[PDB]
Amino acid sequence: NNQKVVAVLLQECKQVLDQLLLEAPDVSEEDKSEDQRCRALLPSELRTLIQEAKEMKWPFVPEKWQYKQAVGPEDKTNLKDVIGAGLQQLLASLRASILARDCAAAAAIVFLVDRFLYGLDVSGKLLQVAKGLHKLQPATPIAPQVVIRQARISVNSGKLLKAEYILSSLISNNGATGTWLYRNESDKVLVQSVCIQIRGQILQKLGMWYEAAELIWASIVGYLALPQPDKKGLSTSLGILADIFVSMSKNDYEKFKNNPQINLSLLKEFDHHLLSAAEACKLAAAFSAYTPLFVLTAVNIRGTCLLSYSSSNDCPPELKNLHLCEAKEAFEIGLLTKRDDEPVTGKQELHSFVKAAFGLTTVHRRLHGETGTVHAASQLCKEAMGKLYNFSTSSRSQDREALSQEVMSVIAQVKEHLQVQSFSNVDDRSYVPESFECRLDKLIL
Ligand SMILES: Nc1ncnc2c1ncn2[C@@H]1O[C@H](COP(=O)(O)OP(=O)(O)O[C@@H]2O[C@H]([C@@H](O)CO)[C@@H](O)[C@H](O)[C@@H]2O)[C@@H](O)[C@H]1O
């Protein structure tokens, strides 16, 4: 599960597809047998997911908690774990399906690993494999999630018009793409809603804060328009909306707030853009209570907003301590997203943990001045930042594992020196306090 290894394997798959383009179809019984074998040795859950993806059951691979309201223990997991555990074998089955010229199945595996590989910043090579599949057998259906993935890397690269042709093609034509078949009409609205969200991100990249916020609101409406509302998308859009609220000026936020078409409770309940942002982050963390990373990012932004507002001249002195305590709670939740000592992978998650440490130390400095524990916690924070940037710059996998473990050890030490106490929740699988009520009805007035 390394970027370089996976990237090289995807390159090999692409080379195989090119060679098959030069060769005439002659699938040997060995090829078919190794295809069936490689798929059969995968765990049952992944075989089911592969068959469902191949059958075009959904345009996105869903999470068990994403569409269910009456959630339970079997729903409170994330596919990152099962996919990450069988990634090597999923790629072996991908190569095997390519050699068997079963491009529909190979595309199904591409669909399955798409999200995890985006986390590894290797979506380009994966999309090269998809293009080779389409070159061999043009009728091979490609999931809208993968097309949108192309849009995503194009936005991340600054190719805004290129991404916008993809997004606009999906939006203006009811999500139609290639030879993909929707089983119901609502999945089209879902694809449209993700594309509209990405339009919001494009306008955010351009600093058109008001219109970006409007598009994000539209994506929220679309997520609510589904038979089962998309809680994951709502969490994402609430976070993006929070960042936009932070970047907005006060006149931007006032113009957005005075638009009656936008029936957001937080828009009419708060008058300061940082407080609206903090509330939007609270809701975003509530809506992804079983995915600790997004809870951590959301509460990080929340704590930053409350820290910034508490020091503002717009904050009444009676509430300064209350908002500082709210920021303290937020950063505490963020640090509590990691329990006991499980490894932490990814520069983003690590960076978010150090961000939570800096936030909590800053809040303590605001509450108790320059105490000794603020100095010790500050030293631990700077150490964690040093090992963090060493991690980000290192190319040796073992150094990255070691620096990650050390950085998390430091994080645990700031947790001890600052007395972060676990919160009470009747849902031991949830990463948010009960105060963070997951209520979709309160989003709307
Ligand atoms: N709840 C969340 N909070 C904060 N950040 C989040 C988040 N969920 C995802 N992210 C970040 O957004 C980036 C793209 O996400 P993805 O899961 O890689 O996209 P995709 O595989 O197409 O899955 C679809 O995502 C839609 C939105 O949530 C994101 O566009 C959902 O509405 C669809 O139902 C579907 O799940 C990435 O950087 C991730 O870390």
Q: How far apart are CA 271 and CA 290, in angstroms?
A: 30
- Separation of 72 CA from ligand 1 center, angstroms? 22
Nearest CA to ligand 1 atom 6: 236
- Ligand 1 center–CA 233 separation, angstroms: 6
34 belongs to a structural domain: yes
Give me the domain span that covers residue 345.
1-63+73-445
- Given a contact cutoff of 8 angstroms between Cβ atoms, the answer to whether 100 and 35 are in contact is yes
Measured between alpha carbons, how far is 156 from 3 in angstroms, rounded to an integer? 18
Asked whether 329 and 422 are in contact (CB, 8 A), the reply is no
Closest residue by CA, ligand 1 atom 26: 233
Structure token digits, residue 292: 């600790």
444 alpha-carbon distance from chain centroid: 24
Q: For ligand 1, atom 27, name the residue with the nearest CA.
A: 233
CB 356, CB 296: distance < 8 Å: yes
Of 97, 92, 123, 122, nearest in space to 108 by CA? 97
| Residue 68 domain flag | no
* 37 to 10, 29, 104, 135, 152: CA distances (angstroms): 20, 12, 17, 26, 34
Pocket residue to mutate for ligand 1, from 118, 166, 236, most atoms within 8 A of Cβ: 236
* Structural domain count of the chain: 1
232 contacts 63 by C-beta, under 8 angstroms: yes
Q: 337: CA distance to ligand 1 center in Å? A: 19
Residue 361 assigned to a binding site: no
Asked if residue 294 belongs to a known ligand binding site, the reply is: yes
- Are 355 and 337 in contact by the 8 Å Cβ rule? The answer is no
Question: Where does residue 30 rank: exposed (0-12), middle (13-18), buried (19+ CB within 10 A)?
Answer: exposed
Contact 67, 231 (CB under 8 A): yes
Number of Cβ atoms within 10 Å of the Cβ of 185? 10
Residue nearest to atom 15 of ligand 1 (CA): 115
- If you measure from the C-alpha of residue 236 to the centroid of ligand 1, how many angstroms do you get, rounded to a whole number? 6
The answer to whether 261 and 410 are in contact (CB under 8 A) is no
Confirm whether residue 60 is marked as ligand binding: yes
* 135 belongs to a structural domain: yes
Could you identify the atom of ligand 1 that is nearest to the CA of residue 145? 22
The reply to whether 37 sits in an annotated binding site is no
Written as six digits, the tokens of 170 are: 């999906």
Q: Tokens at residue 250, please?
A: 């006060």
* Rounded-to-integer distance, Cα 91 and Cα 287, Å: 32
Q: Residue 33 CB: number of other CB atoms within 10 A?
A: 12
The candidate with the shortest Cα–Cα distance to 359, out of 313, 307, 426, 309, is 307
H-type alpha helices, 311-346: 320-336
Q: Who lines ligand 1 at CB under 6 A?
A: 60, 115, 118, 145, 148, 194, 197, 230, 232-233, 235-236, 239, 284, 288, 294, 297
C-beta atoms surrounding 72 within 10 Å: 11
